[PDB]
Amino acid sequence: GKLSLQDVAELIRARACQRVVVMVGAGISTPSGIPDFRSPGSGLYSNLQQYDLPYPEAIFELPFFFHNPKPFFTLAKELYPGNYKPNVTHYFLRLLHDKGLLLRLYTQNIDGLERVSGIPASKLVEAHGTFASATCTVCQRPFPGEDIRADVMADRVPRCPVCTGVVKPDIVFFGEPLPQRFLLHVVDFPMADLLLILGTSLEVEPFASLTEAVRSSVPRLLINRDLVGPLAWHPRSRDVAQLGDVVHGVESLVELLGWTEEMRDLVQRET
Ligand SMILES: [Mg+2]
Ligand SMILES: [Zn+2]
């Protein structure tokens, strides 16, 4: 390709990339042991098979939730903050933020590990929602996710202190609109001077096609097992793919940036 991984690192070292936009998916959190509720032979999957569900995805369907919210709250309990820990990929993104280079981080994940790694909410677009906040299904009052933590950990369906309605985490269910902050793409993508794509199969719209929203003068760096989605289908001259294990790819980039010590120190502070 006209650009290498090292070329991208050198742009960053020269401070030519002050406004990095990042897109991440499930691939970045596999190293943290996040279980896939859809995958046969996880504890979460087997746990979900005691409920009268037609398929595991029904836990993200509203008509099922209002019939019985307990299956969804089983997933909430497993993925609620505290259970899992960020990995090097998350800390790399935290370093980008610390260095003042992160414009915005778009995530498909609901594991909340970006927040745990210390990336401020204002830098995040959690495209599938989050457990950091919740909303009463009846009166629409917002609450911090901490307010329902105890109920969640005790297998009690959390209820609103005003109207007693079920309080549901701000996780996006099928048919629901994307979160309001998704429309930050309108300003972020035209402004980006680098796009980083990590650990996503780019199979789902409209998240996938955000890759096309950056300018053609702007490099798109993919760190992923494979070349996927619009990057595969509509490649551009300044695209760079570092294909293989995501953690190995990130560590390669860290080396080319010359950020080995800072990563070491960050990780040690956080762990
Ligand atoms: Mg209460
Ligand atoms: Zn209420």
Residue numbers in the entry: 121 to 391
The authors write:
Sirtuins consist of a highly conserved catalytic deacylase domain of around 275 amino acids that is flanked by unstructured N- and C-termini that differ in their length and in their sequence. Of the seven members of the human sirtuin family, Sirt2 is mainly found in the cytoplasm, while Sirt3 is the main mitochondrial deacylase.
Again, apo Sirt3 crystallized rapidly in diverse conditions, over a wide pH range and at different temperatures within days. The formation of the apo Sirt3 crystals was therefore dependent on the presence of microseeds. However, they do show some differences within the asymmetric unit (r.m.s.d. ranging from 0.2 to 0.8 Å for all Cα atoms of each monomer). A similar behaviour has also been observed in the published crystal structure of human apo Sirt3. Using these MMS apo Sirt3 crystals, we were able to solve the X-ray structure of apo Sirt3 at a higher resolution than in the deposited X-ray structure.
